Amino acid sequence: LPGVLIVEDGRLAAATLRIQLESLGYDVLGVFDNGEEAVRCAPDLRPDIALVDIMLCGALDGVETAARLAAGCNLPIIFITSSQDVETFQRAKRVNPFGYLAKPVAADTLHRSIEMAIHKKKLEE
Amino acid sequence: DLPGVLIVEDGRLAAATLRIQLESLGYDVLGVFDNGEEAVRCAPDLRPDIALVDIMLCGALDGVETAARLAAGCNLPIIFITSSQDVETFQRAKRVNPFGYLAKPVAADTLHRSIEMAIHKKKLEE
Amino acid sequence: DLPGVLIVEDGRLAAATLRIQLESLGYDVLGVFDNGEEAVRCAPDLRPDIALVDIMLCGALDGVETAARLAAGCNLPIIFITSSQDVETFQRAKRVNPFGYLAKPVAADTLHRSIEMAIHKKKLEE
Amino acid sequence: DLPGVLIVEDGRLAAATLRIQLESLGYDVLGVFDNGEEAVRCAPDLRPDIALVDIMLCGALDGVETAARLAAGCNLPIIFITSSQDVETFQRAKRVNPFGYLAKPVAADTLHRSIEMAIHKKKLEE
């Protein structure tokens, strides 16, 4: 079977991909949540392809993990992105959330958003 | 008298960072869920004051449907956690020269097609 | 290219205090108005990114009606500046759907994050 | 929008089949070329979104150098149509970095998914 390496920050996302690949006759060789140990364990695993989360953060981010996988084990890379289109924000609008916090979230902004959100609810009700 | 926070976040680093941040600032982290279905089910028993919900969610319910149910069945204010995928990450990614890009959630049909195309490509080249 | 803030505030010292806080944060304050009718008149010309409205305005248009018009006709996000506790006015304020409520004396750091978050929410949802 | 496709193919049945497959999928076929020299000359003015080029062509310019000039000159994603399996023409083809290689006979859904992934890769990396 063609061997697949997965690098994915999301717990269920990594799992979903594994199960999907395995339902289609693939052999998933390693599933990693960080780039350094993916790049470290990949040579002694010899995969045919790497699937990499473009939005991976940490010691090695998504792009630099892929770069080192492509140069190291001579792997082709497929990047896994989010489908964050304006259409999803149109559906999000309808639930009327307090607002949106982009990753990585700052502590000050996190606290202030939580407290103005709770205060808005209290005042309006 | 800690305000109680429920978090729906699949990302291991974001979910761990947000626990740490919130527990420092003086909040009760009531539960962290990697899917919307569990979140919606556990929430009335947890009685949160607020939900932090990632807009990108694998599982039955997407992030938006998850927040809609948390705003209704549990009477919660919602803050969405969003991604930071700027053009600058795709300019760096170009330099890797990847085979391509697949948006989450990926259909197993598309996933299988792209892999077989990518391997066979790599065979013919270096 | 920092955001353009429009202030609607009856108390002249509070307006000034607000202007001081906003200028110290870096924001450009485009106009300060004490009656709501003329704020709505000037709004399309000076093109603000956000409007800070005193919920307790009286006269020609009240705070709620001034914000209702700015929010709908100029597509401005609204933060209400509050002092009193009249439940009835917070009911009508709900209907303009403001971003939040800031109680005077306003802390600058809350002011800064509210404005950032209000404009950001507006950007994504457009 | 459904992309504009340029075809460079000297096999007359292959050329015909490709033109039919694309049009039945919706695509607008902008031009069909027997030879690379004239493909490279006419393509900047056609303004294609993608080129399907046979890896082997008769004339002054082979497949590999037609596609190299089409990719570098029109900022164009290139899919190669292959049969042939010559080792070092592929090692030269690597240096064009095409989206991929489609072995004849080409399944019309393999072609569709290659074109949509080739364009999306370029759009994202833009």
Write a compact overview of the structure shown.
Four copies of one chain form a homotetramer. With 125 residues, the first copy, chain A, is of the alpha/beta class.
Describe this structure as you would to a colleague:
With 125 residues, chain A is an alpha/beta fold. Chain A has a single domain (1-125), classed as Response regulator (Rossmann fold, 3-Layer(aba) Sandwich), CATH 3.40.50. In chain A, 46% of the residues lie in helices and 21% in strands. The longest helix of chain A has 18 residues, at 107-124. In chain A, 44% of the residues are buried. Chains A and B meet through helix 1, helix 3, strand 4, helix 4 and strand 5 of A and helix 1, strand 3, helix 3, strand 4 and helix 4 of B.
Tell me the greatest interface: A-B, 62 and 66 residues
Report the β-strand fraction of chain A as a percent range. 15-25%
User: What is the CATH architecture annotation of chain A?
Assistant: 3-Layer(aba) Sandwich
Structure summary, number of beta strands of chain A: 5
Q: What fold name goes in the CATH topology slot of chain A?
A: Rossmann fold
Query: Could you give me the name of the CATH homologous superfamily of chain A?
Result: Response regulator
Domain Response regulatory (chain A): 3-118
Protein name (chain A): Response regulator receiver modulated diguanylate cyclase with PAS/PAC sensor
Modified residues (4-aspartylphosphate) (chain A): 53
PDB class: lyase
Task: Set out the fold topology.
4 copies of one chain form a homotetramer.
Chain A: E1 3-7, H1 11-23, E2 27-32, H2 35-41, E3 49-53, H3 62-72, E4 77-82, H4 86-93, E5 99-102, H5 107-124
Parallel strand pairs in A: 1-2, 1-3, 3-4
Helix pairs in contact in A: 2-3
Domain Response regulatory (chains B, C, D): 4-119
Modified residues (4-aspartylphosphate) (chains B, C, D): 54
Protein name (chains B, C, D): Response regulator receiver modulated diguanylate cyclase with PAS/PAC sensor
